[model samples]
Target: MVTPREPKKRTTRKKKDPNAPKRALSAYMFFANENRDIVRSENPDITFGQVGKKLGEKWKALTPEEKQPYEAKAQADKKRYESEKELYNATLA
Candidate 1:
């Protein structure tokens, strides 16, 4: 006699709130945004997925000195986000 297997429980994903705060971008994200277009232009025949890998390699190759500007931008953006989040929370209270 073959025993029937129990049915697996369904899992539900949490929905993202439309009113949630926007996250600040990291230095790597800024680097990707600035360089993705350039990489695409230089490698016109490359696949979209390959462009991401190329960007990862480029980001890895950058020295701290080269990465400073993106880091600075991320810091500034983080500060701006914190200030805005405070005001938003105050408004909610």
Candidate 2:
């Protein structure tokens, strides 16, 4: 009688190019980029870490309408990344 053999596992991992452009930021990060400093200035007594916490809280408190601009900006950045990535990949061909 023949014994059943175990299936082989693939071990190769794709390497990422160091020269590739960085990925697009999420909407919340884009919002934080613009507003983190403002929040810090408004509360000078707050520590650097507290500024991030405040920014996160502010983001959570935003209404959908208030968040639209950030979401739109992220979408636009995504499109830009797609175009740039296409060109970068083409050069590698």
Candidate 3:
């Protein structure tokens, strides 16, 4: 019979492996996206905007088809929101 501690070792290694295939949207990106909206809505802080900008830049620098739509949407949304902040606040929030 296996001990609980030994089973947990495998789980720990899997979690620590940076090269492991991610099963879902990344946690870092998820929070960046979430906080970007919250900051746009509630806080006047610019960190979220900066986070989104950096993420978009990184995505655009990548060469993967897996990222095309997101990269395109991020760029479009950044431009649209920057250009129409007040209209967006009035209509969507």
Worst 10 residues of 2 by lDDT: 13-22
Cα-based lDDT for every prediction: 0.78, 0.78, 0.50
lDDT of 1 by residue, 5-93 (tens): 87777868876643334677678778988888899999988965899778878887776886887787888888777766776687677
Which regions of candidate 1 deviate over 4 angstroms?
Answer: 1-22, 83-93
Clashing pairs in 3: none
- TM-score: the better of candidates 2 and 3: 2
Considering every candidate listed, which one attains the maximal TM-score? 1
Score every model by TM-score: 0.59, 0.57, 0.24
**Which candidate, 1 or 3, has the higher lDDT?**
1
Q: 1-93 in candidate 2: lDDT tens per residue? A: 888878877668776774455787778878888887888789888876788777888777776776888787888898777766887788898
